[PDB]
Paper text:
We used the results of MD analysis as a guideline for determining the crystal structure of the 14–3–3σΔC/TAZpS89/TCF199 complex. In agreement with MD results, additional electron density from measuring crystals soaked with the fragment could be observed in a pocket distant to the peptide binding site, between helix 8 and 9 of 14–3–3. Although electron density coverage was not complete for the entire molecule, we could build the fragment in a possible orientation where it sits in a hydrophobic pocket with amino acids Phe198, Met202, Leu205, Thr217, Met220, Gln221, and Arg224 interacting with the fragment’s fused ring structure (decahydroquinoline). The carbonyl group interacts via a hydrogen bond with Thr217, and the phenyl ring interacts with Tyr213 via Y-shaped π – π stacking and via hydrophobic interaction with Lys214. The phenyl ring shows a lower electron density, suggesting higher flexibility or the presence of different conformations. The pocket where the fragment binds is conserved across 14–3–3 isoforms with a difference for the σ isoform, which has a methionine at position 202, whereas other isoforms display an isoleucine. To our positive surprise, fragment TCF199 showed a stabilization effect with a 34-fold change in the Kd value of TAZ binding to 14–3–3, from 1.38 ± 0.44 μM to 0.04 ± 0.02 μM. The distance between fragment TCF199 and the TAZ peptide is substantial, with no direct interaction, hinting that it would be difficult to achieve selectivity for the client-derived peptides bound in the 14–3–3’s groove. Based on the data obtained here, we speculate that TCF199 binds to TAZpS89-bound 14–3–3, which has a closed conformation and links helices 8 and 9 together. This results in a reduced flexibility of helices 8 and 9.
14–3–3 proteins are a class of adaptor proteins that exert their biological function by recognizing linear phosphoserine/phosphothreonine motifs in several hundred partner proteins, which are modulated in their behavior upon binding to 14–3–3.14−19 The effect that 14–3–3 binding has is client-dependent and client-specific. When activated, the Hippo pathway acts as a tumor suppressor pathway in which TAZ is phosphorylated by upstream kinases and its activity is regulated by binding to 14–3–3, preventing TAZ translocation into the nucleus where it interacts with transcription factors such as TEADs and induces the transcription of genes associated with cancer. Here, we focused on targeting the 14–3–3/TAZ interaction with fragments, which is a physiologically relevant PPI within the Hippo pathway. Briefly, the TAZ-derived peptide surrounding phosphorylated Ser89 (pS89) completely occupies the 14–3–3’s binding groove.
Author numbering:
A (entry chain A), C (entry chain A): -4 to 71, 74 to 231
B (entry chain P), D (entry chain P): 86 to 95
The structure:
């Protein structure tokens, strides 16, 4: 790894600078380097890792959707040659590479060292998320297995979160939100998505009374996304 | 599409 | 060049797709490949080249400004180590590399084959612009020479544009706009900047009567930027 | 700062 010679603390500092500069590819490289030091990540460091890669893959997903739409239109009328497919495939392969990189960091060795609920759920949610992003572009004989890998990671995270975290915990909420998106957008299970979003929202509502003002703000922000989806889906 | 979680969670 | 095996027309097509997908690094790579085919560029192709690199360097300039501001604040109070300087230098070196790449394409061999006023002025303006971006970050013993290289390119473009193009020509207007920015922001010549912006604006105003509705829209868009700067500068 | 030209010019 090209970050092997940089101090862990310097990598974290530079990831924060890269975030401020909106240099998310750099930020991801710095955070990958930090992970590769082999030590566990703190809460703040896990968040930096996620911000970095979410922004990188977000640009790729947005580009892939633009290109896929153009490609589908080109098949509805004039023949334009292989270029749209080729360039969609180029972006797709790069996106798959980023997802594979994240999944590799989780498997070597973030998840296996994560013993506390907050870290383990966060990483299993991330595993589900990056398999979900792979599923968004999958079409061949492995699509079903990719979908099931996302489902399995989300389900393990859900099982831990329900046993170990209050219903308003932002990690628990974000996980449930994303698993509901998986059901609606990936698994062709809109009813499951709606039911999960509704139960998550109501159970969180009932636990808000235990929270400080700052925690209330964190939890209600994610609850609003559940509500926004329920409005789109019903 | 649908809304998913922000990257940073407390 | 990694684009040597791709057809010129396919590179242009993919540059347009990359633009739609907001993949400006790809767009620049495709347009560099197109230039390296050795043929002259059409008006539309010159615009694609400029859009691609302007967006790439724009992200780098924005990042450099964020980092430079943090670095200057860190010198006003706690010592934080070499990391801010190092990362500012990393972004700076990448920015300089992009500018050097563009200047290299102009020198090998776009400018020397550009005989028509519209192409030659466009490329000389670009040369001034990329030396200007180098000047924005220059500090050592070559800063004066970088500034003078920008000035010389802009001046040659101005001399051609005044002889060969009407005052409302969008290339002429954009050149004058950017040379005025050079005077104000780089050369410590705000009066020259103001005078150039004013004379450019008034001479364009007087030529609008010759234009069609579509050309009028093109020219007045750039004239508004001259006015916006005059408001900032006075 | 100051406004500079858009990249595309007709
Ligand atoms: O955001 C807020 N309120 C708030 C936040 C911060 C400071 C002050 C007030 O709650 C959103 C939500 C959950 C809690 C009750 C209101 C409800 N409204 C529908 C969506 C979920
Ligand atoms: O944009 C427009 N007008 C317009 C454009 C498109 C269609 C209809 C009208 O002109 C801007 C400018 C130059 C020309 C006269 C007005 C003037 N106003 C100050 C700035 C320069
Ligand atoms: Mg036809
Ligand atoms: Mg542990
Ligand atoms: Mg929150
Ligand atoms: Mg102190
Ligand atoms: Mg020629
Ligand atoms: Mg215009």
């Amino acid at each position: 790894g090209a970050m092997g010679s940089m101090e862990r603390a310097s990598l974290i500092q530079k990831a924060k600078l890269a975030e401020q500069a909106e240099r998310y590819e750099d930020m991801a490289a710095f955070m990958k380097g930090a992970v590769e030091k082999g030590e566990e990540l703190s809460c703040e460091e896990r968040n930096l890792l996620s911000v970095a890669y979410k922004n990188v893959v977000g640009g790729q997903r947005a580009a892939w959707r633009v290109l896929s739409s153009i490609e589908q239109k080109s098949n509805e009328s004039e023949e334009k040659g292989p270029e749209v497919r080729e360039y969609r495939e180029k972006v797709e392969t790069e996106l798959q590479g980023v997802c594979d990189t994240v999944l590799g960091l989780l498997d070597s060795h973030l998840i296996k060292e994560a013993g506390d609920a907050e870290s383990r759920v966060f990483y299993l949610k991330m595993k589900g998320d990056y398999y979900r992003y792979l599923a968004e572009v999958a079409t061949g004989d492995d699509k079903k297995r990719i979908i099931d890998s996302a489902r399995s990671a989300y389900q393990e995270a859900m099982d831990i979160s329900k046993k170990e975290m209050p219903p308003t915990n932002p990690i628990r909420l974000g996980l449930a939100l994303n698993f509901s998106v998986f059901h609606y957008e990936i698994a062709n299970s809109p009813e499951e998505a709606i039911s999960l979003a509704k139960t998550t929202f109501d159970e969180a509502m009932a636990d808000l009374h235990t929270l400080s003002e700052d925690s209330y703000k964190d939890s209600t922000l994610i609850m609003q996304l559940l509500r926004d989806n329920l409005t789109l889906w019903t | 599409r649908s809304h998913s979680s922000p990257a940073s969670l407390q």
